[PDB]
């Protein structure tokens, strides 16, 4: 598309998210969600193809259903209490439907089926945008009404999301599907501490966003979509493969890397409320995420896969367009564990 139109659509997406975050009226929040959905669709369809169109229509159907459920729950809440301000829900039934609407928007299981297919269909830049920025608004809405969420529903959906992400990440070969399942598992981790401490939720959001931004930027730099295309990378830019392996180890939760910060802290918080079984289950389940990250690292950097003759020509040309903030993202996603108490800034 035209660069002006693309910039305008990005502005509209960000403005809708900001409107959702800064508004104290339910109708304005719904309007922000509608604007976000309306402007997000062409971004997925920048590179026109049947796969992109199918992913876009799946995403549109899911988001429209979620928005209708959200509006209907708002209507019930208004019925049982004539209040428009975003505060305590005031209705048991309204709360359940709003939670499902926000879970549909986020992608938590069992509403997770659309995420892998939408991520696979669209390009890498669109996948980066979808998996990073589209999650700020529903998470902010959930944080604003954390005192009203039923702990049983939220915690069981978080458990299901972590289990499903861990299990589904093992079978996938394409990198985009692996990233989608990783996002599902990370949000399963993330929404489990909402009833207890939203600061941990925001900290996990920041850390996850940093790691996944680094990961998609590295995947864009070395234009690889399948596992073997990534295995071919070591023959040209071994530094990229090494940095990607370090980032993958960080995303697995291995100390002293940055990815160990959220889980640990989250576990600590859930131990303050005398919840012991669930953090243990979450760690043992995240071992599966670690396993498929380790398999990807084995395929990418720790071993040298067979190359192709034509690769010699790629030796002669340099990466023309260089993306900024990649070194900063890698450093922030790998070596920030000693600055953990900074989470007291209520980030």
């Amino acid at each position: 598309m035209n660069p002006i139109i693309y910039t305008t659509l990005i502005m509209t997406v960000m403005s809708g998210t900001m409107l959702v975050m800064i508004s104290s009226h339910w109708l304005l929040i719904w309007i922000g969600f509608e604007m976000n959905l309306l402007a997000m669709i062409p971004v997925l369809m920048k590179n026109f193809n049947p796969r992109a169109t199918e992913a876009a229509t799946k995403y549109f159907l899911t988001q429209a259903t979620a928005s209708m459920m959200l509006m209907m729950a708002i209507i019930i809440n208004l019925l049982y209490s004539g209040q428009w301000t975003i505060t305590k829900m005031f209705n048991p039934v309204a709360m359940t439907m709003m939670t499902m609407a926000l879970a549909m928007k986020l992608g938590l299981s069992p509403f997770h089926f659309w995420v892998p297919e939408v991520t696979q269909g669209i390009s890498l830049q669109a996948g980066l945008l979808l998996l990073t920025w589209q999650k700020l608004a529903p998470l902010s809405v959930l944080c604003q009404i954390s005192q009203s969420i039923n702990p049983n529903l939220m915690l069981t959906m978080a458990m299901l999301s972590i289990l499903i992400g861990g299990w589904g990440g093992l079978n996938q070969t394409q990198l985009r599907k692996i990233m989608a399942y990783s996002s599902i598992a990370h949000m399963g981790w993330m929404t489990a501490v909402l009833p207890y401490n939203t600061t941990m939720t925001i900290l996990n959001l920041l850390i996850y966003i940093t790691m996944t931004l680094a990961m998609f930027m590295l995947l864009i730099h070395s234009s690889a979509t399948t596992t073997l295309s990534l295995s071919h990378t070591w023959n040209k830019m071994p530094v990229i493969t090494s940095l990607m392996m370090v980032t993958l180890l960080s995303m697995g939760g291995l100390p002293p890397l940055s990815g160990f910060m959220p889980k640990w802290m989250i576990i600590q918080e859930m131990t303050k409320n005398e919840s012991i079984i669930m953090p243990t289950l979450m760690a043992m389940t995240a071992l599966l995420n670690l396993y498929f990250y380790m398999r990807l690292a084995y395929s990418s950097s720790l071993t040298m896969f067979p190359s192709t003759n034509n690769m010699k020509m790629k030796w002669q040309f340099e990466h023309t367009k260089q993306m900024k903030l990649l070194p900063t993202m890698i450093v922030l996603s790998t070596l920030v564990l000693p600055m953990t108490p900074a989470l007291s800034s209520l980030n």
């Binding site: 109708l27 719904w30 309007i31 509608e34 959905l37 309306l38 669709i41 049947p50 796969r51 169109t53 199918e54 992913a55 876009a56 229509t57 799946k58 549109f60 159907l61 429209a64 259903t65 928005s67 209708m68 459920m69 509006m71 209907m72 209507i75 019930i76 208004l78 019925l79 004539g82 428009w84 089926f113 892998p116 297919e117 939408v118 696979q120 269909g121 589904g168 599907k177």
Partner: protein
């Protein structure tokens, strides 16, 4: 809580079920979506007018506008789906899979 609100909520639930069934014909899916929207409009209008909450009379119209825009968007997508396959059958969207 009178029977009118119960009937409207039941209509919304029936429309949601019809949307989630997916026999075929994605056009029917959009129709079920917009039936849910119509039920929402009716319920919101009744609730707002019943309590004489005057400043809330803006809310339904705005709602309708936005929802209709979404419908247009959906229609556009449907068209391209047909243009790719010749028909709007739901089962044609099996290229992307878990």
């Amino acid at each position: 809580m009178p029977l009118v609100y119960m009937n409207i909520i039941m209509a919304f639930a029936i429309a949601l079920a019809g949307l989630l069934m997916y026999r075929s014909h994605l056009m029917s899916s959009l129709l079920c979506l917009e039936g849910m929207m119509l039920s929402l409009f009716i319920m919101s209008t009744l609730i707002i007018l019943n309590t004489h909450f005057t400043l809330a009379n803006m809310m339904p119209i705005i709602l309708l506008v936005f929802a209709a825009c979404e419908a247009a968007l959906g229609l556009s997508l449907l068209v391209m789906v047909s243009n790719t396959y010749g028909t709007d059958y739901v089962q044609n969207l099996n290229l992307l899979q878990c």
